[PDB]
From a paper:
SARS-CoV-2 binds the host entry receptor angiotensin-converting enzyme 2 (ACE2) with the spike glycoprotein. Neutralizing antibodies against SARS-CoV-2 spike glycoprotein, primarily the receptor-binding domain (RBD), are essential for COVID-19 prevention and treatment. As the vulnerable sites, we focused on ACE2-binding sites in the receptor-binding domain (namely receptor-binding site, RBS), which have pivotal functions in viral entry into host cells. The structures of the SARS-CoV-2 spike protein complexes with NIV-8, NIV-10, NIV-11, and NIV-13 Fab were determined using cryo-electron microscopy (cryo-EM).
NIV-8 interacted with the RBD (R346, Y449, Y451, and Q498) via CDR-H2 (Y106 and Y107) and CDR-H3 (S52 and Q57) (left and middle); however, there was no direct interaction with S443, whose substitution with asparagine substantially reduced RBD binding. As the side chain of S443 was inward-facing, the loss of neutralizing activity by the S443N mutation was likely because of the conformational change in the loop containing S443. NIV-8 was added as a reference antibody that broadly neutralized the variants but did not recognize Y489. NIV-8 escaped by mutations at sites 346, 443–449, and 499, which is consistent with the binding profile of RBD mutants. As expected from the binding profile toward RBD mutants and DMS analysis, 84.8% of NIV-8-escape mutants had K444M, and 14.5% had G447D.
Residue numbers in the entry:
A (entry chain H): 1 to 125
B (entry chain L): 1 to 111
C (entry chain A): 333 to 526
Amino acid sequence: EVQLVESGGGVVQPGRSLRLSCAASGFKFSKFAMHWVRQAPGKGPEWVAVISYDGNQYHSADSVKGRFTISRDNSFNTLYLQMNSLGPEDTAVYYCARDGPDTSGYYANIYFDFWGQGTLVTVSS
Amino acid sequence: QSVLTQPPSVSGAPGQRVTISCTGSSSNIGAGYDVHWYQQLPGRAPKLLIFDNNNRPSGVPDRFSGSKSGTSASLAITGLQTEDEAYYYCQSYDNSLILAVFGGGTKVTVL
Amino acid sequence: TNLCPFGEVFNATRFASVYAWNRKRISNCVADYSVLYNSASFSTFKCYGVSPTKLNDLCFTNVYADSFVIRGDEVRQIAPGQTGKIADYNYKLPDDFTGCVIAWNSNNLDSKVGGNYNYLYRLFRKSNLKPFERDISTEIYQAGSTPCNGVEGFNCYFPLQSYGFQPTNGVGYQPYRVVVLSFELLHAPATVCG
Ligand SMILES: *[C@@H]1O[C@H](CO)[C@@H](O)[C@H](O)[C@H]1NC(C)=O
């Protein structure tokens, strides 16, 4: 069964940096690309970043560009997300999601088939 | 913020049908990209419900159907029960902003 | 009086890889090239041996149409008498070619965030291609002196390479869709004109 578990969330004062990860199991982790998706409390989900299946190519959302860096370890079956200089608008429940296997029409369509559980990340003092 | 526009809430009673309409702009849906739907139970991670136009995945009842036309999409629930008390989201892709976009979400209520 | 099917070749959802280009025969029907030439959406329309304007007045026995997707910098190698990694190992045009070459940018359809790796192109081969030939054998390449089989360790390289397409690439890296026609213009009763 495809299952993903994440950890690394906690309360932090503004201005610091955090690093969290989720570990996959039950499928060939090398073959599939991965995405990071956050969800603010009360609103809809928002897309964050994506990494290729080998780590050579990646992409990030315009909102968090220059602050969020993502990395991947193919042998260890873990992928990491690094945040620098957290702001008050970064409180969410970050999920790590798996890219869709088959999408039929066109090549630019993306969808998320298996989701993790999420970690509560909040910033205050 | 949510690029796709979605109604805030849809009411209903067991027995009949309810519909959710997810409308988009020229770039996101009018270009030709498809529409996907997820279901998020209260207190649980969102789960894929309708990938691609209709095309239900494994392990789902047939009560859920969807279609896309023009610049909008609609999801249909048939023979509603009390079990469907949750949130539903519509997702697509945008070629001008260059990122995946999500809908505002609709809370389906069963009376 | 059949309209001729140019709509399931130009508007196909997914083109094929350059190393396995797909060819379609065209017969009977009634071609109409004025609409194609007046679309004003193609960035390249080169015709060898016949001017595009006079294409509604002469007709042929059959018309061949083959299509593929290649990089934005290799589009100049699809021409008679050119050299490169595409013209030598993937697609070769004879020197007495008579047809038209059409290409247009297709970034919005063939590239996705995180990289698109479903398009391949041959990169290693022991000899160049004769005009209008395909090869789809993926036998391990033999380089150096020591012979190797079924292994890719040292001096034995997998032939096919993978294009990496992303929407943020430069103009010289975004994918391009190419369609090449060909006309015989010799003998036999003609079948395609109007
Ligand atoms: C492809 O579809 C578009 C949609 O309007 C149409 O304008 C165009 O003529 C079609 N291509 C061909 C070669 O007919």
